[PDB]
Amino acid sequence: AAHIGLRALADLATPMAVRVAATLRVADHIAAGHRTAAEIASAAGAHADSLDRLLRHLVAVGLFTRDGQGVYGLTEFGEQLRDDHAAGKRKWLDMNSAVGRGDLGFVELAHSIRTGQPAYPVRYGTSFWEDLGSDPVLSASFDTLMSHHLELDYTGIAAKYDWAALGHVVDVGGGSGGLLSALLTAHEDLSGTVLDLQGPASAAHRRFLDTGLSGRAQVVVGSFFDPLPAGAGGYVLSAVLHDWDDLSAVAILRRCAEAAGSGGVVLVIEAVAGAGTGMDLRMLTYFGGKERSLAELGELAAQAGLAVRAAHPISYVSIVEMTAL
Amino acid sequence: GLRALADLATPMAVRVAATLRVADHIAAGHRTAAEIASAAGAHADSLDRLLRHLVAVGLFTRDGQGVYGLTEFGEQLRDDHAAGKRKWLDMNSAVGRGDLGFVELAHSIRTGQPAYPVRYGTSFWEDLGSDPVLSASFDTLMTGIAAKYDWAALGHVVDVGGGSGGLLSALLTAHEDLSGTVLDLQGPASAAHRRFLDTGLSGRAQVVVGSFFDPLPAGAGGYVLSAVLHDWDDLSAVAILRRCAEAAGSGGVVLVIEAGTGMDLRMLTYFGGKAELGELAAQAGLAVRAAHPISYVSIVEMT
Ligand SMILES: Nc1ncnc2c1ncn2[C@@H]1O[C@H](CSCC[C@H](N)C(=O)O)[C@@H](O)[C@H]1O
Ligand SMILES: Nc1ncnc2c1ncn2[C@@H]1O[C@H](CSCC[C@H](N)C(=O)O)[C@@H](O)[C@H]1O
Numbered sequence: 001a002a003h004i005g006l007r008a009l010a011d012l013a014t015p016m017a018v019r020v021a022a023t024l025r026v027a028d029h030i031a032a033g034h035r036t037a038a039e040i041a042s043a044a045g046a047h048a049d050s051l052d053r054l055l056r057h058l059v060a061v062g063l064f065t066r067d068g069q070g071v072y073g074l075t076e077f078g079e080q081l082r083d084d085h086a087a088g089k090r091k092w093l094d095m096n097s098a099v100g101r102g103d104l105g106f107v108e109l110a111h112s113i114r115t116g117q118p119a120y121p122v123r124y125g126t127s128f129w130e131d132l133g134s135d136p137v138l139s140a141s142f143d144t145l146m147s148h149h150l151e152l153d154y155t156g157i158a159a160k161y162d163w164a165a166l167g168h169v170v171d172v173g174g175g176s177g178g179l180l181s182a183l184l185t186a187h188e189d190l191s192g193t194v195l196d197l198q199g200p201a202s203a204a205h206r207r208f209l210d211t212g213l214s215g216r217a218q219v220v221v222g223s224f225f226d227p228l229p230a231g232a233g234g235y236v237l238s239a240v241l242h243d244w245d246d247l248s249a250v251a252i253l254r255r256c257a258e259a260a261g262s263g264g265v266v267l268v269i270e271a272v273a274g275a276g277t278g279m280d281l282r283m284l285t286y287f288g289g290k291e292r293s294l295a296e297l298g299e300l301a302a303q304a305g306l307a308v309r310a311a312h313p314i315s316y317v318s319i320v321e322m323t324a325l
Numbered sequence: 326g327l328r329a330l331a332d333l334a335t336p337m338a339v340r341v342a343a344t345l346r347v348a349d350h351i352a353a354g355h356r357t358a359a360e361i362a363s364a365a366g367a368h369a370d371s372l373d374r375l376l377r378h379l380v381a382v383g384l385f386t387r388d389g390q391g392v393y394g395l396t397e398f399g400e401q402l403r404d405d406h407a408a409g410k411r412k413w414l415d416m417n418s419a420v421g422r423g424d425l426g427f428v429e430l431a432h433s434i435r436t437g438q439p440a441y442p443v444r445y446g447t448s449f450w451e452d453l454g455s456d457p458v459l460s461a462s463f464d465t466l467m468t469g470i471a472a473k474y475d476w477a478a479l480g481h482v483v484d485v486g487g488g489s490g491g492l493l494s495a496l497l498t499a500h501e502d503l504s505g506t507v508l509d510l511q512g513p514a515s516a517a518h519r520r521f522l523d524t525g526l527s528g529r530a531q532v533v534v535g536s537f538f539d540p541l542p543a544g545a546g547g548y549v550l551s552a553v554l555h556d557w558d559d560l561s562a563v564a565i566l567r568r569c570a571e572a573a574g575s576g577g578v579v580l581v582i583e584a585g586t587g588m589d590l591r592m593l594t595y596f597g598g599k600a601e602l603g604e605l606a607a608q609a610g611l612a613v614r615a616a617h618p619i620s621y622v623s624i625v626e627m628t
Binding site for chain 1: 328336341343384414416427428430593
């Protein structure tokens with residue numbers, strides 16, 4: 001990766017140009033017939049002269065084509081910007097999407113490096129969760145993005161662990177219930193509850209009504225820093241811990257160990273340090289969170305009165321099993 | 326990849342490192358996360374996470390002891406390095422600072438206005454004009470034109486927005502009997518002072534600190550402005566031209582002299598700027614009378 005050049009590696013022009021085009025849905029406009037800078041500008045609500053400059057830059061990058069008459073077109077590479085593209089990439093870049101909005105926080109990375117605190121608040125004046133809690137567009141956006149994450153690393157998850165033996169599973173920070181949905185469908189005698197904030201919890205309850213699972217699945221609006229529904233055989237922490245600093249992480253794990261007691265299990269499911277540095281920084285900038293190794297996970301577990309008993313690889317992520325220490 | 330082309334993590338990681346001058350500290354002897362963070366005044370745990378990302382990028386080396394080192398490429402982060410890249414990335418540096426303005430690029434695309442103000446609340450030229458350091462960083466980080474026009478006939482020429490010594494120094498050097506004055510903001514003008522001073526042009530070269538938007542120093546046989554046109558919107562320009570006119574009065578000629586798609590977007594981000602144009606200047610101001618193309622850059626004379 002050293003074969004690029006210091007400056008080029010630090011370039012912000014191209015990444016932002018791509019993000020602006022994704023946001024302005026430029027690719028969809030030209031595919032719809034709006035081909036000139038003027039046509040695309042009036043269609044996307046932009047300034048023709050300025051938009052043209054951004055298009056020229058993106059042509060140089062190879063996403064678009066421009067003939068001698070100023071008529072633009074999509075290259076096979078540019079087709080990826082279309083909102084209907086099968087790879088679903090435009091969504092991650094749109095500044096209106098949860099992650100598209102959040103990645104701009106990297107502009108304030110110096111603050112996180114100097115303080116260890118999240119950069120997202122320095123840019124938007126509030127926490128990521130608070131923002132999603134106030135805006136259903138952002139919340140729904142983040143949920144959709146997570147569903148995409150579930151597909152990639154969770155397919156066949158029901159077969160990678162003995163979920164049936166749990167009897168009842170509590171998904172702590174379970175989102176809209178996509179994971180619990182997959183588990184209950186495969187294991188018909190299993191029951192479970194989604195514990196999350198109003199937003200996701202409501203979406204999950206809506207999901208259960210829709211797929212006819214409300215009978216075995218329920219929802220609990222609550223904070224995982226507070227006492228959790230006790231008595232369950234297992235508590236799942238799916239892509240949650242990396243969102244928090246050590247202090248908060250142990251707080252969450254501690255509430256899980258509490259609820260699980262001597263008889264239950266706590267399952268942390270996420271990419272152990274074994275994504276990498278890139279996601280780690282994203283976690284730091286967004287929430288002051290972090291990617292951890294199985295060892296760091298063990299250190300956190302001990303502090304909550306828990307112990308790692310096993311770690312099951314399932315894809316890009318792993319399932320780490322913990323029980324009363 | 327597309328999501329890769331849009332990555333912001335690595336570019337900012339690079340810029341934060343340059344700003345904290347991690348490479349310099351390392352070369353100085355601080356090779357541990359805690360030691361670098363101590364020298365750079367950062368949070369050790371967080372700094373270590375940034376360095377690990379840069380190790381994977383190929384700028385830094387890290388041994389199983391926790392000691393960090395610089396790779397061939399990492400050497401370029403040295404504020405001492407010959408290529409002088411550090412200046413382009415240091416958030417304290419002219420372009421290292423304005424570049425973060427790219428995060429507001431959407432504003433420029435939707436309106437045509439500079440993004441920089443949306444981030445910093447002040448304009449780019451305002452800040453540079455207020456800090457001779459910041460100013461000098463942008464200039465260093467950036468001839469025959471005289472042998473192409475009859476400057477000598479002007480007698481005295483006011484380089485409007487003449488930045489630092491620049492063109493006037495070359496004009497006065499090509500015409501040993503011409504005199505000139507650089508009109509610009511405090512920042513650039515200071516530099517213009519040191520230059521003309523060392524270049525022994527004290528006798529025929531002078532500097533006046535002021536805005537080219539209010540009454541200008543009249544008299545001069547000609548008022549020249551290069552690389553000052555695009556930095557502004559039409560109005561701004563004609564607004565500036567009006568000043569030259571009121572100081573030229575067709576007794577003098579107002580001259581207007583004028584590669585990188587990424588550089589083009591930087592200009593849009595920084596200034597929201599960019600012959601019928603100079604004519605649009607002729608319309609609401611001094612009338613065009615010629616144009617003389619030199620290489621890439623032309624010279625549109627008025628009066
Ligand atoms: N204090 C809190 N209490 C409960 N849930 C919270 C919370 N703060 C954040 N969350 C939830 O933690 C989740 C992290 S991201 C989604 C995780 C989900 N298990 C999945 O795999 O998709 C989000 O749903 C967020 O709403
Ligand atoms: N309001 C203002 N009044 C005077 N000079 C200004 C100004 N705003 C910007 N400038 C100057 O305009 C110049 C733009 S950079 C181009 C400089 C030009 N090529 C030259 O002859 O040196 C900078 O020096 C900037 O400081």
